Every structure is written in C-alpha cells, then in structure tokens.
Design an enzyme around this catalytic site. Structure first.
Site, mmCIF file in Angstrom:
data_model
loop_
_atom_site.group_PDB
_atom_site.id
_atom_site.type_symbol
_atom_site.label_atom_id
_atom_site.label_comp_id
_atom_site.label_asym_id
_atom_site.label_seq_id
_atom_site.Cartn_x
_atom_site.Cartn_y
_atom_site.Cartn_z
ATOM 1 N N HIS A 40 0.810 -1.209 0.000
ATOM 2 C CA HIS A 40 0.000 0.000 0.000
ATOM 3 C C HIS A 40 0.850 1.268 0.000
ATOM 4 O O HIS A 40 0.325 2.381 -0.044
ATOM 5 C CB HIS A 40 -1.034 -0.006 1.146
ATOM 6 C CG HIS A 40 -0.508 0.424 2.482
ATOM 7 N ND1 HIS A 40 -0.117 -0.471 3.457
ATOM 8 C CD2 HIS A 40 -0.396 1.654 3.038
ATOM 9 C CE1 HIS A 40 0.210 0.189 4.553
ATOM 10 N NE2 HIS A 40 0.048 1.481 4.325
ATOM 11 N N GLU A 52 19.610 6.761 7.607
ATOM 12 C CA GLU A 52 18.884 7.898 8.157
ATOM 13 C C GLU A 52 18.564 7.887 9.648
ATOM 14 O O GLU A 52 18.310 6.836 10.234
ATOM 15 C CB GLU A 52 17.544 8.032 7.420
ATOM 16 C CG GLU A 52 17.627 8.521 5.992
ATOM 17 C CD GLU A 52 17.744 10.014 5.933
ATOM 18 O OE1 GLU A 52 18.144 10.582 6.962
ATOM 19 O OE2 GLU A 52 17.446 10.616 4.886
ATOM 20 N N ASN A 54 17.730 11.630 11.556
ATOM 21 C CA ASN A 54 16.856 12.789 11.407
ATOM 22 C C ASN A 54 16.595 12.914 9.914
ATOM 23 O O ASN A 54 17.481 13.301 9.172
ATOM 24 C CB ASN A 54 17.533 14.067 11.898
ATOM 25 C CG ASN A 54 16.596 15.256 11.870
ATOM 26 O OD1 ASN A 54 15.888 15.479 10.887
ATOM 27 N ND2 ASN A 54 16.583 16.026 12.949
ATOM 28 N N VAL A 57 17.458 16.463 8.153
ATOM 29 C CA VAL A 57 18.803 17.032 8.197
ATOM 30 C C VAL A 57 19.848 16.057 7.680
ATOM 31 O O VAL A 57 19.875 14.917 8.113
ATOM 32 C CB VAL A 57 19.192 17.390 9.647
ATOM 33 C CG1 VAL A 57 20.608 17.927 9.694
ATOM 34 C CG2 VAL A 57 18.202 18.387 10.222
ATOM 35 N N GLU A 62 24.051 9.137 5.317
ATOM 36 C CA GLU A 62 22.987 8.775 4.389
ATOM 37 C C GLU A 62 23.445 8.344 3.009
ATOM 38 O O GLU A 62 24.546 8.657 2.556
ATOM 39 C CB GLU A 62 22.001 9.936 4.197
ATOM 40 C CG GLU A 62 21.402 10.479 5.468
ATOM 41 C CD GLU A 62 22.180 11.648 6.020
ATOM 42 O OE1 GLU A 62 23.381 11.784 5.717
ATOM 43 O OE2 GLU A 62 21.587 12.433 6.774
ATOM 44 N N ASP A 84 -0.033 -7.524 1.849
ATOM 45 C CA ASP A 84 0.486 -6.157 1.810
ATOM 46 C C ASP A 84 2.015 -6.142 1.857
ATOM 47 O O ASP A 84 2.628 -5.814 2.875
ATOM 48 C CB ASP A 84 -0.096 -5.360 2.981
ATOM 49 C CG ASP A 84 0.121 -3.865 2.840
ATOM 50 O OD1 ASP A 84 0.570 -3.422 1.762
ATOM 51 O OD2 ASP A 84 -0.173 -3.129 3.805
ATOM 52 N N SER A 172 2.325 1.248 16.412
ATOM 53 C CA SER A 172 2.933 1.904 15.260
ATOM 54 C C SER A 172 1.822 2.842 14.784
ATOM 55 O O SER A 172 0.724 2.821 15.344
ATOM 56 C CB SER A 172 3.320 0.891 14.171
ATOM 57 O OG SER A 172 2.246 0.037 13.832
ATOM 58 N N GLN A 174 0.471 6.042 11.451
ATOM 59 C CA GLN A 174 0.638 6.628 10.123
ATOM 60 C C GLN A 174 2.069 7.109 9.932
ATOM 61 O O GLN A 174 2.621 7.792 10.795
ATOM 62 C CB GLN A 174 -0.310 7.816 9.934
ATOM 63 C CG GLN A 174 -1.659 7.466 9.330
ATOM 64 C CD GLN A 174 -2.404 6.426 10.135
ATOM 65 O OE1 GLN A 174 -2.638 6.603 11.330
ATOM 66 N NE2 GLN A 174 -2.785 5.333 9.483
ATOM 67 N N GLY A 175 2.664 6.755 8.799
ATOM 68 C CA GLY A 175 4.027 7.170 8.536
ATOM 69 C C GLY A 175 5.003 6.046 8.804
ATOM 70 O O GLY A 175 6.122 6.062 8.296
ATOM 71 N N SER A 177 4.115 2.888 8.176
ATOM 72 C CA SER A 177 3.761 1.876 7.187
ATOM 73 C C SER A 177 4.910 1.459 6.284
ATOM 74 O O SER A 177 5.664 2.301 5.791
ATOM 75 C CB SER A 177 2.598 2.369 6.328
ATOM 76 O OG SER A 177 1.430 2.498 7.112
ATOM 77 N N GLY A 178 5.023 0.153 6.061
ATOM 78 C CA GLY A 178 6.076 -0.379 5.217
ATOM 79 C C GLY A 178 7.329 -0.704 6.011
ATOM 80 O O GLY A 178 8.206 -1.415 5.520
#
Ligand SMILES: Cc1ccccc1-c1cc2cc(C(=N)N)ccc2[nH]1
Ligand SMILES: [Ca+2]
Length: 223
Positions: A40, A52, A54, A57, A62, A84, A172, A174-175, A177-178
C-alpha cells in the site's frame, strides 16, 4: 510510533525511508540491492534513503538511491490489505556499512509472545498529530491470533499477525507503514494497518513476512 522511544542514531541500520519529495513510508533493506516494504506504499518516483536518523537534516551517513523497479505482490488486495508486501530494487547497489545493513529473512515464523522491535518516523500521537524527525522505536510482543482476530472480526488472514498491547498506549502509526517488525534478528513483519493508533483493544496489524520468503527470494533472483 506512539508510546515508543528515540532509537538512537543508526541503531536500526536496516530501516529505510521511502521519499517522493517527502518521507511517506518505511522499508527494510534485505541486501545491497533490495528493499521490502508494504504494497500500500506503492507509488512512482521512489527514492530510497538509507543510513537515516533525522530525516530532515543531512547528518553524514545517508545514501540516497533511486528505485529502478517496484514489484507489488501479485495477490495484493488493496481493499483488505491481504498480501500487503512489495519489493523495491535500487538503481545502484548500496554501500553496506555499520549504519547501512541488511536484515535477514526468517527461516520460520515467529511464535506468539515473542518480543519484537518496531520502528519508524510515523505519528507519535494517539490523538492528534506530531511527526518526529528522528527514528522512533517500540518493543512489542506478537499477540495470539485469537486476540488479533477478536479485535478485527473477519478482517485477519493467515498473512497477517498482530503485535503490541491491548491496553493501548504503544503502537505503530501513520508514517510507519512499510517499516520493519524484527524479532530474534529476523524480519517477521511489515507495518500494515490497524484501527487508529495505540487505542485500547486495537493492536497493530502486520504483514506476516515468513509466508513470503520463497516469493521474495525467487523474485529477487529473477529481477
Ligand atoms: C493502510 C491504511 C489504508 C487506509 C487507511 C488507514 C491505513 C492504516 C491504518 C494503520 C494503523 C496502524 C497502527 N499500527 N495503529 C499503522 C498503519 C496504518 N495504516
Ligand atoms: Ca538525515
């Protein structure tokens, strides 16, 4: 992540942020060229961000790599979120190091009661909205399938499992996800869905990765 804690910079080296001009989902690095996430979370123009902490920034560890291909599970049903799961291939192989590492796939499913680590940059509020910049962590046990199915009658399939606390307060959101649900060093779950966040008797629902190991291995080997 609601009711969690600040992980610590790069303490979850397999955690990835999917970016399409902004962070929109988490993911897990399974090898230098592949990432596992939720179906999804599918979208065009995905840039995988590794190493990653922050996400607003540039801190120095990274690696920003564009996706070359995305493969949503053939049986993914967007209405029910059954199956999913999706695979994302990096245009160029990531440089593996202590801050950017892969997480192993399970050789068998995890049992109820097993403690796992869930992480992400999702909303930290159970009521309202607040997005952290640094990675958040949460230790949560896999719940019995009966407690899972009782909370979501007729919605849980054999490809899903619940984890968290029925009393609420930790979950957990929203955000996230995955993102990964790691237990005993194996990627056993993917943040998929649930009802609200950290609500009583409404635990998080996760994609049961152990059911997809053959599909993951065969798909990566052929792409
Ligand atoms: C996938 C989806 C599609 C349409 C509406 C809502 C969702 C949803 C619900 C939850 C719930 C949780 C949770 N653990 N409380 C986490 C992520 C999450 N995503
Ligand atoms: Ca950063």
């Amino acid at each position: 992540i609601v009711g969690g804690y600040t992980c610590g910079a790069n303490t979850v080296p397999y955690q990835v942020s999917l970016n399409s001009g902004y962070h929109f989902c988490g993911g897990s690095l399974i090898n230098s060229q592949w990432v596992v996430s939720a179906a999804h979370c599918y979208k065009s123009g995905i840039q995988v961000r590794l190493g990653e902490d922050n996400i607003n920034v540039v801190e120095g560890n990274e690696q920003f790599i564009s996706a070359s291909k995305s493969i949503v599970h053939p049986s993914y049903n967007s209405n029910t979120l059954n199956n999913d799961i999706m695979l994302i291939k990096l245009k160029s192989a990531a440089s593996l190091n202590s801050r950017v590492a892969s997480i192993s796939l399970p050789t068998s499913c995890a049992s109820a009661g097993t403690q796992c680590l869930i992480s992400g940059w999702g909303n930290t509020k159970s009521s309202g909205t607040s997005y952290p910049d640094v990675l958040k962590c949460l230790k949560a046990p896999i719940l019995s399938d009966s407690s899972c199915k009782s909370a979501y009658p007729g919605q849980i399939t054999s490809n899903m499992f619940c984890a968290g606390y029925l009393e609420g307060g930790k979950d957990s959101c929203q955000g996230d996800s995955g993102g990964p649900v790691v237990c005993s060093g194996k990627l056993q779950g993917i943040v998929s869905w649930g009802s609200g966040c950290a609500q009583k008797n409404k635990p998080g629902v996760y994609t049961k990765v152990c059911n997809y190991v053959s599909w993951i291995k065969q798909t990566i080997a052929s792409n």
